[PDB]
Amino acid sequence: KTTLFCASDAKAYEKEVHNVWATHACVPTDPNPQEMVLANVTENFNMWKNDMVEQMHEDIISLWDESLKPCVKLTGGSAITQACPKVSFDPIPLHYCAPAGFAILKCNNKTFNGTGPCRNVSTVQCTHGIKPVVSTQLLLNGSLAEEEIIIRSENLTNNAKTIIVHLNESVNIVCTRPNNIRQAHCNINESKWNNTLQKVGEELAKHFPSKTIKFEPSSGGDLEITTHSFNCRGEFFYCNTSDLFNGTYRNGTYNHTGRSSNGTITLQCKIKQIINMWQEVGRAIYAPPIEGEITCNSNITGLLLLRDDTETFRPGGGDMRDNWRSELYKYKVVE
């Protein structure tokens, strides 16, 4: 369509990499909110062909390649070495704004599944504040569904299409490596995981009716996708989810078949140094983990699943563009 720019709310004094990159490439955020409503102005969206997603993907790649410089980067035959200094790392919201002569349409149907027509469409200058959170399996620190859970997918009958489950009630996940230096663990509440997976199962049954829904651990692939992986305070966490995606949904009953304990599920995690880059096909070797207790307290605001007589779903991810899509679904650049 055109070239979108970014307005952040970053502070220049901050040594945090997100703030630095933003203040160099993002303009200041406009204080007054310019929004233009419309009642019957029907319009069509396709989150899966959105170009905003591609632009933000480019900018996030530029961020990570300017901020989390690896000790070594293996791309094909090349091996590039740089300084890999540890750095303060905490995502900051970024808004994507339409330049002059261009608008951003925003679908206001609280149940829009990302494909097709929208009843209530507004006109804005900037998207809401989006946090470029890189993760797999679980979507972290996102915005929730205002009404009920939504199931987004390009083709719900194509096993290959990644399913984005968009929740309406966040679920607390706490991950920590306290004072093996790469051993860490995560805790989630078994009761709230109950409710979340049971309601996701109800919706998934709305879409797949006869068959009984099943949640199973990640089939196979690189460690970065067979586990819930993410960056926390700087370090790369890889966490096991087999005690998380592990239940069955039959006649409105979701029985969780994962190993809980005292009411909380813990996940075993390793802090790996050889990362399989999401930006491009290559590897990145980073410096050994710092000291202190590294801990992140995150919200599970979404899921990435992949289907395969009953229907079974597994944690997926890896195309970091799906993360951006999960937030830019309700937007479209126009004019």
Ligand X SMILES: N=C(N)NC[C@H]1Cc2cc(CN3CC[C@@H](N)C3)ccc2[C@@H]1NC(=O)C(=O)Nc1ccc(Cl)c(F)c1
Positions in the binding site for ligand NAG (CB under 6 A): 91, 113, 115-116, 133, 140-141, 148-149, 151, 153, 155-158, 168-170, 189-192, 194, 199, 203, 216-217, 223, 226-227, 230, 232, 240, 242-243, 246, 254-260, 263-264, 296-299
Breaks (C-N over 2.5 A) in the chain follow: 179, 308
Q: What is the C-alpha separation between 279 and 234, in angstroms, rounded?
A: 17
Q: What is the C-alpha separation between 219 and 40, in angstroms, rounded?
A: 45
Q: What is the C-alpha separation between 90 and 9, in angstroms, rounded?
A: 14
CB nearer to ligand NAG: pick between 98 and 244: 244
217, interface contact from ligand NAG, ligand X, none, CB < 5-8 Å by kind:
ligand NAG
Pairing of strands 138-140, 331-334: unpaired
CB-based contact 299:170 (threshold 8 Å)? yes
Give residues 128-157 in contact with ligand X (rule: CB under 6 A).
134-136
CB-based contact 60:320 (threshold 8 Å)? yes
* 100 touches ligand X by CB under 6 A: no
Structure tokens at 39: 């009642």
Helix, strand counts (H, E) of the chain: 5, 25
Q: Which stretch binds ligand X (CB under 6 A): 4-12, 55-63, 87-95, 316-324?
A: 316-324
CB nearer to ligand X: pick between 4 and 59: 59
Pairing of strands 312-315, 213-215: parallel
Q: Which stretch binds ligand X (CB under 6 A): 102-110, 165-173, 244-252, 277-285?
A: 277-285
Among 222, 293, 308, 335, binds ligand X (CB under 6 A): 222
Among 10, 188, 275, 333, binds ligand X (CB under 6 A): 275
Q: What is the C-alpha separation between 301 and 196, in angstroms, rounded?
A: 10
**Min. distance of Cβ 241 from ligand X in angstroms?**
13
263, interface contact from ligand NAG, ligand X, none, CB < 5-8 Å by kind:
ligand NAG
Positions in the binding site for ligand X (CB under 6 A) = 134-136, 222, 224-225, 229-231, 236, 275-278, 281-282, 318-320
